[PDB]
Design an enzyme around this catalytic site. Structure first.
Site, short mmCIF file in Angstrom:
data_model
loop_
_atom_site.label_atom_id
_atom_site.label_comp_id
_atom_site.label_asym_id
_atom_site.label_seq_id
_atom_site.Cartn_x
_atom_site.Cartn_y
_atom_site.Cartn_z
N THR A 1 0.85 -1.18 0.00
CA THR A 1 0.00 0.00 0.00
C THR A 1 0.88 1.23 0.00
O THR A 1 1.84 1.29 0.75
CB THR A 1 -0.94 0.01 1.22
N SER B 1 3.19 0.52 3.13
CA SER B 1 4.41 -0.25 2.98
C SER B 1 5.35 0.36 1.96
O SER B 1 6.55 0.09 2.01
CB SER B 1 4.06 -1.69 2.61
N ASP C 1 8.01 -0.94 -4.26
CA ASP C 1 7.43 -1.79 -3.24
C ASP C 1 6.67 -2.93 -3.90
O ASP C 1 5.95 -2.72 -4.88
CB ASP C 1 6.48 -1.01 -2.34
N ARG D 1 -3.62 -1.52 -5.26
CA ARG D 1 -3.32 -2.93 -5.03
C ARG D 1 -3.67 -3.32 -3.60
O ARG D 1 -3.32 -2.62 -2.66
CB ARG D 1 -1.85 -3.22 -5.31
N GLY E 1 -2.46 -0.09 5.87
CA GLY E 1 -2.47 -1.08 6.93
C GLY E 1 -3.61 -2.06 6.78
O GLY E 1 -3.86 -2.55 5.68
N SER F 1 2.64 -2.60 -3.54
CA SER F 1 1.97 -1.46 -4.15
C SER F 1 1.92 -1.66 -5.65
O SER F 1 2.84 -2.23 -6.25
CB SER F 1 2.67 -0.15 -3.86
N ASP G 1 -2.44 4.03 -4.23
CA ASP G 1 -2.38 2.95 -5.19
C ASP G 1 -3.71 2.19 -5.19
O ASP G 1 -4.65 2.53 -4.48
CB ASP G 1 -1.23 2.00 -4.89
N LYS H 1 -8.70 3.26 -2.07
CA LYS H 1 -8.12 3.51 -0.78
C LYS H 1 -8.28 4.94 -0.31
O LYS H 1 -7.92 5.24 0.83
CB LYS H 1 -6.64 3.14 -0.78
#
Lengths: 247, 240, 202, 204, 239, 232, 220, 229, 233
Positions: free
Chosen positions: G1, G129, G166, G19, G47, G169, G17, G33
């Site tokens: 994320t 993340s 990442d 994902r 999270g 993401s 993002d 999100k």
């Protein structure tokens, strides 16, 4: 405070419960509601009270309130207290289904509401529910059934009964033109309109002043179907004409 | 006229004409103190003025007060039963601090009179408790709406005002001061204090001394609630 | 975190870093760890940031309601007692190292360190945080009784700069706050305004 | 991994004006099957089914807790539920016991009762809703049928192409999973009819 | 029937159960308290009913904190109840804020406890008025008085009891604002004896307690060497 | 919680709500139980048949357990609370004792529950009496009667409801060892006692007989007219 | 994320993002999100996604209670303090990792809200993340008081830096521009990477799957 | 400690007289008119303050519940607000469960079930408030009246307040089933004119409409435009 | 009109004053404490001949060494004599000793005046008990006999009659009792006084007798045992 209390749940010196007997007279001036058991179904025939010209047609009925997949009720008395009772019967009907994965038997649903109604006549110091209310249903153990439940908390199984205004005159007409083990459904719809003429003070019926629901079995599934306006207008005209062929 | 049947005289249940016969007696309880409070808002100010009857020579007159500081920016004047007065002030001071703790900004006068009136409605609907025999007038400065003068009553009714009176000479000083809500704005500047004092001076026929009243102000230049000193009141009382 | 308060004659001088770390990643490098509890009473926050922000908001609620009833500006000891009662009841749940400084009309500029556990001592100067361990010898060497306002501002800045240099959990900018009778004079030391100290040669 | 105790695999796939939902038939213990007729797809409407995998006591409990709340809903609201609203009903039900969760990750699949708009959804064990337009999977062989449905799914499939896609993606996934299988049942939900086909699978 | 509950106003807006409970204070003997330049001096005309009671029974001067004293008048069992309430509020203040409770705040916390029993049918109002008095270096001398309604006002002199009006005229001609505490005790005992009726209520024992600058702000009973030098002074001007 | 004393004492030491709950019993349909040698017979007097009852669900003889069955008189809704709470206690007693109840045990449970609402806050007494019949493990037949006061007694024969002052005067002059000898003659002793109270007469009663194991069965309407014709 | 926010001249720009992974396998290609709270306050969430759903929906409903009670636009300090006092009450057991941001009558305000209940008011924050990848773009290229085009290009470059660096993401970039006047909820603002084109075709013919039994129930 | 007994009991005639007396509080209140057109519902009431000193832009009698449900009262002012803040709370407790805006019938069933409870719970009087509640759900307009008993009724058009019986006869003449919303606002204002006792201006009434764009009450600039016709 | 916890102007606490008048409608019970044992004799007051007289349990076991005799509202006694039985077993459980006759009377009479209607319990007594109780047994102090009026006033008595004919049987107990008579002479004296006061003809069906000796336990007489005593009278 003892001064402000009215003692709703005490006995009369004759052995009566006043607030129960006073709730019974709230029902004798409510809308006339009757129910007739037949060999292939049970019906409800409520005389509609809210018959004003500027009323809308929102939700499915006015005084029926289907309870379950297999059983429906019909109320007469305090309109608001009936809505609290009918949410409660739907909870009992779904707590039985959650607990047993079978539909609630109809006598066991009436018994459980009548325990909630009795509990407000014995403890708590509240007024009772001024709602007497009919019940139609199907179950595995006895098939088609019909119940009535007074505000006292006692109930009874009936073949034909009536609550509401002019209920005593409506019962006596159901004592004579009802035949046990011999009533079809179509014969019982005609008996419903026959009773709803001599127990409604108006000149005739118009189907804006009545509401009829029938409960039958169709291929292993109970259907509860409020009759539409044209389906009852044909039943009124089938009795408004056949009364001319009997005089 | 007014029928009565049952315990309409004693608990807040309905009269046969649906009057809440018991709530109308808490308005008579406001007149029992014998005092009159006048509130008026200008264009950049809102003023409260009330009588200060220190009837005993032995009273500490610094403690005989009806003006109260609810927040730093909201002021109050109370009229009625003085013990019921102080209880509603502590409840207003408490409800105004939970707002800052829960929502992070200073409470409006809009929502402090609304919450205090919602408390007063509960007294008018539960039989176990009487209404408070007192009325609250709150003043303050909102961000967008400016000066506000809101009054809640024992019924639970909290409407907003250009100018309010409360207490004994309330009707004589509403009928008077509604004539000054005529052509423009009741002189809507810092000498709405003079509008507030001469309103209370007329219905009492007193022509007050410097220390017979107490005045509370808010302004836009000073949004904090200030209680005027007797030297500051006499600067206004000698101007009229 | 490195927090600091020094008392002078007539008020207090506060001091903090600005680095909040989530492990060894700097999650925020411009934090204001000098939370105003009232108009002349601040606190410096060290420890868990969720803990110290919840205690400071609770005490700001309790102290502001206390001052509105009593109709008096509150005491710095009264604010520090509310911190002590907060993080002693909840000492096994709230990992919060607080120092309270402020000014009150009764007994002047006061400093109270309430460390983890919830004791409370009045001190003439006190430090706290993870970087406080690096400057105990420095603040004990050059503290002097009777420093002025600008002399305590130089002392708090020099001690925070020495701790930001040695602690990974300390850094960013120096936030100073001087609370006196007149009010609060906050200032941020950034970039070349942090006092520089020579490293060894060769 | 407690959701691999009984095994199981439920998958729902969207077509053009029709949805498909599918599940395996195996009821089991950690590696032992008991019956080959275990129901994991439940009729939450006229044309709206939920499919539950995971721990089999919660596959039965959540389907009964949802049938409890939906029959209260359909009596009180006087209408059938919309498939987006059932999704929020399950997401409230799974989150209300968040600490100590129901070990099921349900998929729902149905048609909008007044638009016939296709709807598929997937939820986590604590009720995080996932609305997709392609496909949703849930169960022990999630990775087996993620990549299996990433290849076979095409947009705007007929009901006959949709059956041949979801059934070739269930069979090839549960034959690659140890604790999923013993049959696959498939419901094709269209506007005029619900067709239900159990299909020949490997019984190992 | 507008007077059987505290949750009932009269048709002219009066709560009679509150106003009946302040008749109970008016049937109690007069307790006065005078705030002066150095502190606060209390004085109670304590009617001793029987000769069989020990000198000090049914005490009317209470210590509610080490700096605050309490002179009560009215139903005495209710007075000892509110003395315990005022002790708990003074205790909880120091356990939560760490310093001695101000007399402004202590009087307002207790008056809102008294007010809380003027609102409901579940309780009755307290049958006692009571004065509070303290001294601080910062706050100075302070004297508040709380009625059974729950209203608290600051006074230079208050005179709760039977001879309330008769004692207020003696306090009003005293000019307490410039007099010291050892001069007020000689005057409080004068005011107690002049308002006592030597015909209706026979026997009485004078109780005196100050709190002032001479005690470093501690509240205590006036000592017998100073008490007897004021009772002798009071009889000499009673003639 | 509604905590107010409803049953209080009066001058001359009477509990009015207990006395008024017993007037609710006297306005109810008449119930008769007699006790034979190896037979107990309960019979209630249906006041109105009306040709529209589903009579299966207004039966006034219930069944508490396999060995205990009771008949009531009074407020019908108050009885159904007492019938159901006795049925729960008859199952808890099989849970903890591994034995069926005695008839005096469930009579003590019903009477102490009926006493409890005469002395608890916020409750009226039950407006029922209960004729409880049964059999011990030893096989002795039992017949008990509870009152709204919470008092219970054993009986050879008893009658509750309306007209019970005349039915008990009948049974005190006709209960002997000879009429309690044959099991069929015991059944006609209830029917003869009921027909003195049924002011309309005929086959408008309900009656249930319980012998020993192969337990309780309520008699049919044409199976009751066979006895009424044998006493015509 | 990877979620991020920035404060430009006269507003605020949020980014995210799309994902959602179930471990190290991608569940949702197109997760939303950025969440509604009020018409002037949105909130990005990282999270535990079920925690951020059932937390932002409650603070949105609490501010729906609060706004039409007060009759005015809600404040971002109010949404902060409902969030941080709830997350402190659960003591981090609900993982709401939030980039609350919005424009009230006092200006544009942006907050990062950590799951234990600490907050911080910065001109730019990132969470998730892929936050450390997205801070590297903001520590490089942020300057105060940018235009909308300069700030949207910076948040989309920061979210894409979390996308390509990442593993947790990817798949799209959501934007949300909140100013005093407008509200631009740009759901596919950028498609940085799309699915490859299938070189074959694997559709089964009707009859490729054998069946055992078959029921058909028609619908009314 | 709170009374645990019902203050509303049945009279010997079979009537709950505290409800019947709370209806008398409603029928003394200010007149409120609701009209359901074919694409919207208009709620209008008489907002006639007692003096010139009262701020008309301060308190409101037509209050929104959701973005799509608003309501108006005749009866007691403060009993309305406890009932209108619980209605706003019941509407969001639905939205947290179902993530769908609450149906207008379902809000009225939840509000009236509250109003039933204060006719039977201990130590409380009923509300002295009737409610005209409007809403737009599933492409249909809705208008409900919630009586102080807790009974609800769907109305095409009705009125409460003072002269409600005279006003409801005026609705039965000038109500077409196929009106538009803009033609129903004029007929709602004319019903407030049939008993007003004065000259009604933009500040002396309060109008709220609900179409498919949601619920909103009309600005006093917008009320003056409809009073010109 | 008035609550249950209300004092008369004479200070009598009305509901207890009326619970004492309830005992005067109950059947007559006699207790006599001798040095060789106590005896408890009660009228059964057979209402109907069909009533089985073995169910009129106006004398009960409390423990093996204590028996109680009741009069008044027999249903109200069953909560007092069950609290009596549990208190003796809780005393035996804790202390491994038989509970004394005074302390069982002291524990039961603490339940009298423990009524009220203002949050006295979630389940509390609305009213006082309409019973008088005659506890009688043999403890370490020997044979003892106690009375338990509904005011919670308990008193040790040498001989005490309670019930509808107590004022008149207590006048007969004071004439014939002396401090050295035997238990056989007390059983016989408790039936001449029951003969004066009962309405029906006194036989072995309408009386109930039980004694507690220091040697033997509590026991209630059988039908065959009572026939010997009535012939002696």
């Amino acid at each position: 405070s003892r001064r402000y209390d009215s003692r709703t749940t005490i006995f009369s010196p004759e052995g009566r419960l006043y607030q129960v007997e006073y709730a019974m007279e709230a029902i004798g001036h409510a809308g006339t509601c009757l129910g007739i058991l037949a060999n292939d179904g049970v019906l409800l025939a409520a005389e509609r009270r809210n018959i004003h010209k500027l009323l809308d047609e929102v939700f499915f009925s006015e005084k029926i309130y289907k309870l379950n997949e297999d059983m429906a009720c019909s109320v007469a008395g305090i309109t608001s207290d009936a809505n609290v009772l009918t949410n409660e019967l739907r909870l009992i009907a779904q707590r039985y289904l959650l607990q047993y994965q079978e539909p609630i038997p109809c006598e066991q649903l009436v018994t459980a509401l009548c325990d909630i109604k009795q509990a407000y006549t014995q403890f708590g110091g509240k007024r009772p529910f001024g709602v007497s209310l009919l019940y139609i249903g199907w179950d595995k153990h006895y098939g088609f059934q019909l119940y009535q439940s007074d505000p006292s908390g006692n109930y009874g199984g009936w073949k034909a009964t009536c609550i509401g205004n002019n209920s005593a005159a409506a019962v006596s007409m159901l004592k004579q033109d009802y035949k046990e083990g011999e009533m079809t459904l179509k014969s019982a719809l005609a008996l419903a309109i026959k009773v709803l003429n001599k127990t409604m003070d108006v000149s005739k019926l118009s189907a804006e002043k009545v509401e009829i629901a029938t409960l039958t079995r169709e291929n292993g599934k109970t259907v509860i179907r409020v009759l539409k306006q044209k389906e009852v207008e044909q039943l009124i005209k089938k009795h408004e004409e056949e009364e001319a062929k009997a005089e | 006229r007014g029928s009565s049947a049952g315990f309409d005289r004693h608990i807040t249940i309905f009269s046969p004409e649906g009057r809440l016969y018991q709530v109308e007696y808490a308005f008579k309880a406001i007149n029992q103190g014998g005092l009159t409070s006048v509130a008026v808002r200008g264009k950049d100010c809102a003023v409260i003025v009330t009588q200060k009857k220190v009837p005993d020579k032995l009273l500490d007159s610094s403690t005989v007060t009806h003006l109260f500081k609810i927040t730093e920016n909201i002021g109050c004047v109370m009229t009625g039963m003085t013990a019921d007065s102080r209880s509603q002030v502590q409840r207003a001071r408490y409800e105004a601090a939970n707002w800052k703790y829960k929502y992070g900004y200073e409470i409006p006068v809009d929502m402090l009179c609304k919450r205090i009136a919602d408390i007063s409605q509960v007294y008018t609907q539960n039989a176990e408790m009487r209404p408070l025999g007192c009325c609250m007038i709150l003043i303050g400065i909102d961000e967008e709406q400016g000066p506000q003068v809101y009054k809640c009553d024992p019924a639970g009714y909290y409407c907003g005002f250009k100018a309010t009176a409360a207490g004994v000479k309330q009707t004589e000083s509403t009928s008077f001061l509604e004539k000054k809500v005529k052509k423009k704005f009741d002189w809507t500047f810092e000498q709405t204090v003079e509008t507030a004092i001469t309103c209370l001076s007329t219905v009492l026929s007193i022509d007050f001394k410097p220390s017979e009243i107490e005045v509370g102000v808010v302004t836009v230049e000073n949004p904090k609630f200030r209680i005027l000193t007797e030297a500051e009141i006499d600067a206004h009382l000698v101007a009229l | 975190t490195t927090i600091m308060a020094v008392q002078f004659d007539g008020g207090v001088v506060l001091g903090a870093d600005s680095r909040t770390t989530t492990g060894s990643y700097i999650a925020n490098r411009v934090t204001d760890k000098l939370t105003p509890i009232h108009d002349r009473i601040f606190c410096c926050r060290s420890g868990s940031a969720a803990d110290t922000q919840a205690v400071a908001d609770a005490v700001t609620y309790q102290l502001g309601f206390h001052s509105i009833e009593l109709n008096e500006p509150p005491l710095v000891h009264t604010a520090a007692s509310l911190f002590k009662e907060m993080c002693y009841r909840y000492r096994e749940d709230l990992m919060a190292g607080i120092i309270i400084a402020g000014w009150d009309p009764q007994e002047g500029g006061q400093v109270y360190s309430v460390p983890m556990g919830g004791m409370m001592v009045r001190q003439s100067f006190a430090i706290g945080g993870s970087g406080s361990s690096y400057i105990y010898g420095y603040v004990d060497a050059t503290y002097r009784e009777g420093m002025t306002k600008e002399e305590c501002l130089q002392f708090t800045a020099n001690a925070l700069a020495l701790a930001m240099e040695r602690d990974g959990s300390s850094g960013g900018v120096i936030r100073l706050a001087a609370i006196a009778e007149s009010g609060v004079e906050r200032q941020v030391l950034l970039g070349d305004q942090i006092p520089k100290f020579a490293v060894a040669t060769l | 991994s407690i959701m691999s105790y009984n095994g199981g695999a439920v998958m729902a796939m969207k077509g053009k004006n029709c949805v498909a939902i599918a599940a395996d038939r195996r009821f089991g213990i950690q590696a032992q099957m008991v019956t080959t007729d275990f129901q994991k797809i439940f009729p939450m409407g006229d044309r709206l089914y939920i499919g539950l995998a995971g721990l089999a006591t919660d596959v039965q409990t959540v389907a009964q807790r949802l049938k409890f709340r939906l029959n209260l809903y359909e009596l009180k609201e006087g209408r059938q539920i919309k498939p987006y609203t059932l999704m929020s009903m399950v997401a409230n039900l799974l989150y209300e016991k968040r600490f100590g969760p129901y070990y099921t990750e349900p998929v729902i699949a149905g048609l909008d009762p007044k638009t016939f708009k296709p709807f598929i959804c997937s939820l986590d064990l604590i009720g995080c809703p996932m609305v997709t337009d392609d496909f949703v999977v849930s169960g022990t062989c999630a990775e087996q049928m993620y990549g299996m449905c990433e290849s076979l799914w095409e947009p705007n499939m007929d009901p006959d192409h949709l059956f041949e896609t979801i059934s070739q993606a269930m069979l090839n996934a549960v034959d690659r999973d140890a604790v999923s299988g013993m049959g696959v049942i498939v419901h094709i939900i269209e506007k005029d009819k619900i067709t239900t086909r159990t299909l020949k699978a490997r019984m190992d | 029937g507008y007077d059987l509950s505290a949750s009932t106003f009269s048709p002219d807006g009066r709560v009679f159960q509150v106003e009946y409970a302040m008749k109970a204070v008016e049937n109690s003997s007069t307790a006065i308290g005078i705030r002066c330049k150095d502190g606060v001096v209390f004085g109670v005309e304590k009617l001793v009913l029987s000769k069989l009671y020990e000198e000090g029974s049914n005490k009317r001067l209470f210590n509610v904190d080490r700096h605050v004293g309490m002179a009560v008048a009215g139903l005495l069992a209710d007075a000892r109840s509110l003395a315990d309430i005022a002790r708990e509020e003074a205790s909880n203040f120091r356990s939560n804020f760490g310093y001695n409770i101000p007399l402004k705040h202590l009087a307002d916390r207790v008056a809102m406890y008294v007010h809380a029993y003027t609102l409901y049918s579940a309780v009755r109002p307290f049958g006692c008025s009571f004065m509070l008095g303290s001294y601080s270096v910062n706050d100075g001398a302070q004297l508040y008085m709380i009625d059974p309604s729950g209203v608290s006002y600051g006074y230079w002199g208050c005179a709760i009891g039977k001879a309330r009006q008769a004692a207020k005229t003696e306090i009003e001609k005293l000019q307490m604002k410039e007099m010291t505490c050892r001069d007020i005790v000689k005057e409080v005992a004068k005011i107690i004896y002049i308002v006592h009726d030597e015909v209706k209520d026979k026997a009485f024992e004078l109780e005196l307690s100050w709190v002032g600058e001479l005690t470093n702000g501690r509240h205590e009973i006036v000592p017998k060497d100073i008490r007897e030098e004021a009772e002798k002074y009071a009889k000499e001007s009673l003639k | 919680s509604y905590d107010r004393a409803i049953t209080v004492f009066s001058p001359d030491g009477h509990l009015f709500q207990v006395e008024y709950a017993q007037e609710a019993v006297k306005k109810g349909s008449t119930a008769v139980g007699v006790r034979g040698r190896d037979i107990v017979v309960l019979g209630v007097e249906k006041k109105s048949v009306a040709k529209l009852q589903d009579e299966r669900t207004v039966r006034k003889i219930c069944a508490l357990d396999d060995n205990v069955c009771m008949a009531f008189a009074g407020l019908t809704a108050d009885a159904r609370i007492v019938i159901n709470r006795a049925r729960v206690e008859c199952q808890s007693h099989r849970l903890t004792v591994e034995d069926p109840v005695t008839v005096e045990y469930i009579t003590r449970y019903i009477a102490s529950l009926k006493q409890r609402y005469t002395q608890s806050n916020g409750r009226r007494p039950f407006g029922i009496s209960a004729l409880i019949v049964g059999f011990d493990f030893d096989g002795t037949p039992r017949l008990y009667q509870t009152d709204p006061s919470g008092t219970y007694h054993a009986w050879k024969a008893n009658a509750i409801g309306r007209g019970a002052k005349s039915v008990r005067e009948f049974l005190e002059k006709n209960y002997t060892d000879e009429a309690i000898e044959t099991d069929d003659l015991t059944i006609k002793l209830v029917i003869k006692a009921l027909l003195e109270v049924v002011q309309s007469g005929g086959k408008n009663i309900e009656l249930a007989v319980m012998r020993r194991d192969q337990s309780l069965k309520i008699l049919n309407p044409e199976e009751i007219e066979k006895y009424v014709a044998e006493i015509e | 994320t990877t979620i991020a926010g920035v404060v430009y001249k006269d507003g605020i720009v949020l980014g995210a993002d799309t994902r959602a992974t179930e471990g190290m396998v991608v569940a949702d290609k197109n997760c939303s999100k950025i969440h509604f709270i009020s018409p002037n306050i949105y909130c990005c969430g990282a999270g535990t996604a079920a925690d951020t759903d059932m937390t932002t929906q409650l603070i949105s409903s609490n501010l729906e209670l609060h706004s039409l009670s007060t009759g005015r636009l809600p404040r971002v300090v109010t949404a902060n303090r409902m969030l941080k006092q709830m997350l402190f009450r659960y003591q981090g057991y609900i993982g709401a990792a939030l980039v609350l941001g919005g424009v009230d009558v006092t200006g544009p305000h942006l907050y990062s809200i950590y799951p234990h209940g600490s907050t911080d008011k910065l001109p730019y924050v990132t969470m998730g993340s892929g936050s450390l990848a997205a801070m590297a773009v903001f520590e490089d290229k942020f300057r105060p008081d940018m235009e909308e085009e300069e700030a949207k290009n910076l948040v989309s470059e920061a979210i894409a830096a979390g996308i390509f660096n990442d593993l947790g993401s990817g798949s799209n970039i959501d934007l949300c521009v909140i100013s005093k006047n407008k509200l631009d909820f740009l759901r596919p603002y950028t498609v940085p990477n799309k699915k490859g084109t299938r070189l074959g075709r694997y559709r089964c013919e009707k009859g490729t799957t054998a069946v055992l039994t078959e029921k058909i129930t028609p619908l009314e | 400690r709170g009374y645990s007994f019902s203050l509303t009991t049945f009279s010997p005639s079979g009537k709950l007289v505290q409800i019947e007396y709370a209806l008398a509080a409603v029928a003394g209140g200010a007149p409120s008119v609701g009209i359901k057109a074919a694409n919207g519902v208009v709620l209008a009431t008489e907002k006639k303050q007692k003096s010139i000193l009262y701020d008309e832009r301060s308190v409101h009698k037509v209050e929104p519940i959701t973005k799509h449900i608003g309501l108006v009262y005749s009866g007691m002012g403060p009993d309305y607000r406890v009932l209108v803040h619980r209605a706003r709370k019941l509407a969001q407790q639905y939205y947290l469960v179902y993530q769908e805006p609450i149906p207008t019938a379902q809000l009225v069933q939840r509000v009236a079930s509250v109003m039933q409870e204060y006719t039977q719970s201990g130590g409380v009087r009923p509300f002295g408030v009737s409610l005209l509640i409007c809403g737009w759900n599933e492409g249909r307009p809705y208008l409900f009246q919630s009586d102080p008993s807790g009974a609800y009724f769907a109305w095409k058009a009705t009125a409460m307040g003072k002269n409600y019986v005279n006003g409801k006869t005026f609705l039965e003449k000038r109500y077409n089933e196929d009106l538009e919303l803009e033609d129903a606002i004029h007929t709602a204002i004319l019903t407030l004119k049939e008993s007003f006792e004065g000259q009604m201006t933009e500040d002396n009434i309060e109008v709220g409409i609900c179409n498919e764009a949601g619920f909103r009450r009309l600005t006093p600039t917008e009320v003056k435009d409809y009073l010109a016709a | 009109d008035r609550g249950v916890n209300t004092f008369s102007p004479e200070g009598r606490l009305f509901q207890v004053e009326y619970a004492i008048e309830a005992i005067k409608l109950g059947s007559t019970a006699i207790g006599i404490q001798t040095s060789e044992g106590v005896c408890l004799a009660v009228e059964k007051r057979i209402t109907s001949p069909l009533m089985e007289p073995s169910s009129i349990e106006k004398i009960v076991e409390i423990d093996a060494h204590i028996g109680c005799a009741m009069s008044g509202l027999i249903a109200d006694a069953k909560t007092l004599i069950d609290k009596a039985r549990v208190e003796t077993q809780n005393h035996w459980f804790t202390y491994n000793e038989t509970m004394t006759v005074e302390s069982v009377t002291q524990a039961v009479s603490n339940l009298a005046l423990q009524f009220g209607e203002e949050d006295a319990d979630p389940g509390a007594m609305s009213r006082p008990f309409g019973v008088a109780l005659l506890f009688g047994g043999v403890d370490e102090k020997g044979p003892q006999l106690f009375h338990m009026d509904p005011s919670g006033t308990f008193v040790q008595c040498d001989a005490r009659a309670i019930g509808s004919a107590s004022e008149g049987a207590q006048s007969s107990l004071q004439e014939v009792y002396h401090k050295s008579m035997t238990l056989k002479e007390a059983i016989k004296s408790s039936l001449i006084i029951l003969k004066q006061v009962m309405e029906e003809k006194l036989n072995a069906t309408n009386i109930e007798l039980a004694t507690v000796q220091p040697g033997q336990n509590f026991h209630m007489f059988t039908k065959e045992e009572l026939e010997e005593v009535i012939k002696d009278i």
